[PDB]
């Protein structure tokens, strides 16, 4: 049936990211330079991250031992390995297969991919490097937050205090209303489409690295006998699969907000806000949207309304979905706990 | 949350039931809660029991409407003679607090940093000491060893998740890096309260053979470690059976 996007949508999206970034005044990431001042550190990090898997274990299987070897040597010969890598990214476009096994939760199941140790070592280095350079240059804004500074319950907290301590939401004097959305992005990765990626990454990173990624996804995937090329979606088990993912969701967000309102939340590049901030109360009140917060998939939004605007909406919607039944309160859903 | 407390009671009963059938018995008289709750040292399983409690039971019908507030309790688990047992929830400080304490502590540290700057001195470690454990990032981190390195770690949370995808076993605390976050809870006190609340060392041992080994002197006993056989035997080609 061909790819789903259609060129139309594609072009609109790309242009979006563009005006954003220009507006955001963003310098793309360079290829990791051979002469690097921090480099050994970063490599220390990534390698400890792999090491940690095996810290606890008492019996090591084959693949494992293979790994620990590759690590230990990587500690030993840092200049060697770094050269090895920078080579690999500059060139290699074809990769070993990957292996799925499902793990049980007695309710749900989850896939667990497994890469192959060399490919791992590169990745982990590049993952580490990306997050570092990015957060260094403030790519991702406030509102994208499964982030560093806040353990999750703390996130909940600051989110309430945000809700509240912003101006005026509690005055029901008139008909005034305010509304939260809770959503998922459904399939999000499983629709990520490469040729579009490889562009969107040409934006933010050197055409090499990007290529290393997009090409890093297509693999065979072997469960026992069954095996198939991965032509289309995104494989999450990849050490850097995090990054991309956040990135791609940003694109979703710049839609849901639309340019301006985002530029409220971020403020200038020079003065990015903290999580919930603005300049004047008006900056809150220039729009119905006050808070927007997005955590991996789930999106959370907070609208502030007056009978005017609100009833103009319910004018639109109602106009197109008339129910003299008054049965729109059937499928509608709220909590069974409370 | 009612149903969760319900699940606690069940689950824990189910585990004890495991160790029980591990012999052959569900008989309650054989397993007084000493058996399960004495710390490993005294020769118990040391399992940390927050089943017990008493569980608010009020009149479901209306509690589908009003939130009628607790009017009654239903006995969670039991005993034969009772005593009681301390439960975890009581030894762990709740979030609101720790966020508040964090707030103040980090304020204090703001000032004392401004002084030690103004006076061009380096910190007392005492001026900071009382607050050592307080604070959400847990002041201790400031002085952790490898900091110069850990400046270059970024996005540890995400990684701590997406590990879901990349490997088999859990690491049930994903939500924290003890490096970045400090360490968010301590227990020990529990050990002591469970020890005494069982009636003290001198009763607990009345259940054992400790007066059959002829030792009249207690605390001098460390147990011993059955470390050796596994290294010797495990690796050697034992039949799977």
């Amino acid at each position: 049936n061909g790819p789903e996007i259609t060129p139309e949508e594609a072009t609109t999206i790309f242009s979006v990211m563009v005006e954003w970034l220009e507006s955001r005044s963003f310098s793309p990431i360079p290829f990791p330079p051979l002469t690097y001042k921090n480099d050994t550190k970063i490599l220390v990090l990534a390698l400890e991250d792999l090491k940690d898997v095996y810290a606890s274990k008492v019996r090591l299987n084959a693949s494992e031992r293979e790994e620990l070897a590759l690590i230990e040597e990587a500690y030993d010969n840092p200049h060697d390995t770094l050269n090895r890598i920078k080579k690999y990214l500059l060139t290699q476009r074809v990769f070993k297969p990957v292996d799925i096994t499902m793990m049980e939760n007695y309710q749900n199941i989850s896939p667990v991919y497994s890469v192959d140790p060399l490919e791992k070592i590169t990745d982990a280095y590049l993952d580490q490097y990306l997050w570092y350079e990015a957060d260094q240059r403030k790519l991702f804004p406030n509102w994208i937050k499964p982030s560093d500074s806040e353990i999750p319950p703390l996130l909940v907290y600051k989110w309430t205090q945000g809700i509240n301590n912003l101006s005026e939401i509690w005055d029901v004097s008139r008909g005034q209303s305010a509304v939260l959305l809770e959503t998922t992005l459904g399939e999000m990765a499983e629709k990520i489409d490469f040729t579009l990626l490889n562009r969107l990454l040409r934006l933010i990173v050197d055409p090499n690295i990007a290529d290393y990624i997009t090409a890093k996804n297509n693999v065979v995937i072997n469960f026992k006998d069954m095996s198939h090329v991965n032509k289309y979606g995104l494989i999450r088990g990849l050490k850097f699969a995090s990054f991309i993912f956040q990135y791609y969701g940003l694109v979703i967000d710049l839609l849901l907000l639309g340019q301006e309102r985002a530029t409220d939340l971020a403020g200038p590049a020079n003065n990015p806000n903290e999580f919930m901030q603005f300049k004047s109360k008006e900056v809150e009140k220039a729009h119905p949207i006050r808070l927007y917060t997005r955590y991996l998939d789930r999106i959370y939004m907070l609208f502030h309304f007056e009978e005017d605007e609100g009833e103009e909406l319910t004018d639109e919607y109602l106009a197109e979905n008339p129910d003299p039944n008054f049965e729109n309160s059937i499928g509608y859903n709220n909590r069974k706990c409370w | 949350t009612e149903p969760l407390l319900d699940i606690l009671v069940k689950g824990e009963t189910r585990i004890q039931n495991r160790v029980k059938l591990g012999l052959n018995s569900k008989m309650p008289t054989r397993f007084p809660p000493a058996v399960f709750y004495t710390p490993k040292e005294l020769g118990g399983l040391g399992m940390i029991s927050a089943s017990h409690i008493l569980i608010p039971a009020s009149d479901l019908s209306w509690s589908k409407q009003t939130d009628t507030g607790i009017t009654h309790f239903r006995a969670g688990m039991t005993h034969e003679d009772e005593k009681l047992i301390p439960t975890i929830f009581r030894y762990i400080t709740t979030w609101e607090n720790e966020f508040l304490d964090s707030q103040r502590v980090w304020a204090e540290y703001a000032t004392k940093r401004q002084e030690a700057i103004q006076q061009n001195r380096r910190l007392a470690f005492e001026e900071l000491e009382g607050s050592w454990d307080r604070g959400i990032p847990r002041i201790s981190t400031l002085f952790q060893r490898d900091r110069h390195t850990l400046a270059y770690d970024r996005g540890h949370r995400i990684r701590r998740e997406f590990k879901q995808y990349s490997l088999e076993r859990n690491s049930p605390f994903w939500w924290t890096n003890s490096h970045h976050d400090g360490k968010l809870w301590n227990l020990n006190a529990y050990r002591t309260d469970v020890i005494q609340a069982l009636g003290g060392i001198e009763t607990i041992l009345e259940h054992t053979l400790f007066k059959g080994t002829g030792f009249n002197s207690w605390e001098g006993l460390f147990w011993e470690k059955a470390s050796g056989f596994e290294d010797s035997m495990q690796f050697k080609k034992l039949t799977h059976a």
Binding site: - | G135, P137, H148
Partner: peptide
């Protein structure tokens, strides 16, 4: 400029939400 230890302490302070923009290194 801050130095490896110095970037770290400031980072933790910011993480608390303590730091106002005033005090960041840059």
């Amino acid at each position: 400029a801050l130095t490896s230890p110095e970037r770290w302490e400031i980072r933790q302070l910011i993480a608390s939400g303590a730091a106002s923009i005033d005090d960041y290194p840059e």
